[PDB]
Design a protein around this ligand. Structure first.
Ligand code: MH0
Length: 313
């Protein structure tokens, strides 16, 4: 019974007000690998020591390793679907960006995420380099910077469990997960020029009430239509924790997309229906105002696997 990381629990609890998305690369050498392995061993204790004193702080961290990271830190028994994220070239472009380790810190307060990130980066020193750091907040009643409530159709409880955790199909890595992270930059002027009823056709739901539109009055290119895929005639779900971010003083207004799935082809199928179209050409108009700048795939091991990792200096 491998204990799994808090992948779906935080979302289902609904207490995250702040998040930090740290993407780093391991520097060349073996001391770097030893330091990373020591952090893998002590990460759960670090999270407990940072977040225990704060009642209702809801601190949690999720660590993920990419394909290159895995190759360099562990052996060759790679997980089944751990590979380099593939760039997409359709009506819109989805780039593939570097990154070896991913830390997804969430808490009901910013200082907990800040302190955990500081502790993680101080225990790593020069063994790593930072490729992406992003501080995200909750925008009003779970809305994104486009004004729509995001996360309504996320699976909950057992549904999220079967959506994210790997089963017997890869018996060695049962309890793990896969994640795909993308960073978007929005043009809110262009988005706000469009009327509300049209934006609601583009999304598929109502703006203020957050009610799904009836199937008759939604276009084929509705976002919640192109992201609704089926396997063997049954609906399949992924788990999303998209987070708004930005700085008004520099002009940055963006959304960090993070998607969890036991099978990463589901997320890639959604990404192909969006950037290329389903049918081709019939792409997603959110991409008209949203630009993707990063994209990476990570494998999320179990807590049991992480705690049993030895530095082997
Ligand atoms: C690779 C997949 C994927 C990407 C990328 C993605 C990118 C984005 N999304 Fe969005 N989104 C994806 C997959 C979904 C799903 C699976 C659903 C659920 C639809 C359903 O009916 O089951 C969804 N998105 C649904 C939504 C909804 C409304 C319903 C809900 O929250 O459940 C909103 C407002 C939304 N998104 C916004 C956005 C924005 C904004 C971006 C990027 C800028």
């Amino acid at each position: 019974c491998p204990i799994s990381q808090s992948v779906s629990q935080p979302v289902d609890e609904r207490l995250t007000r702040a998040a930090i998305f740290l993407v780093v690369t391991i520097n060349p050498g073996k001391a770097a690998e030893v330091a990373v392995r020591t952090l893998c061993g002590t990460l759960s204790s670090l999270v407990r020591g940072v977040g225990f004193r704060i009642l209702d702080g809801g601190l949690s961290c999720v660590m993920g390793v990419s394909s290159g990271g895995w190759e360099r830190l562990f052996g060759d028994e790679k997980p089944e679907y751990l590979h380099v994220f593939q760039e997409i070239n359709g009506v819109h472009h989805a780039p593939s960006t570097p990154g070896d380790l991913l830390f997804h810190i969430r808490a009901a307060r910013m200082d907990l995420c800040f302190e955990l990130a500081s502790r993680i980066l101080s225990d790593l020193g020069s063994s790593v380099c930072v490729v992406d750091s992003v501080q995200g907040f909750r925008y009003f009643d779970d809305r994104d910077l486009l004004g729509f409530v995001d996360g309504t159709e996320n699976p909950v409880a057992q549904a999220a469990v079967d959506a994210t955790l790997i089963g017997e199909e890869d018996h060695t890595f049962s309890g793990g997960s896969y994640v795909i992270v993308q960073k978007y930059l929005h043009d809110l002027d262009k988005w706000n020029a469009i009327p509300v009823e049209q934006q609601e056709k583009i999304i598929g739901r109502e703006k203020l009430s957050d009610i799904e539109l009836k199937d008759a009055d939604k276009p084929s290119y509705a976002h919640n239509v192109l992201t609704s895929i089926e396997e063997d005639g049954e609906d399949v779900d992924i788990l999303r924790d998209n987070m708004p971010f930005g700085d008004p003083g520099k002009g940055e207004f963006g959304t960090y997309f993070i998607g969890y799935s036991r099978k990463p082809a589901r997320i890639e199928r959604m990404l192909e229906n969006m950037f290329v179209g389903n049918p081709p050409g019939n792409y997603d108009r959110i991409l008209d105002v949203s630009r993707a700048i990063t994209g990476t795939l990570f494998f999320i091991p179990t807590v049991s696997f992480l705690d049993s990792v030895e530095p082997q200096p």
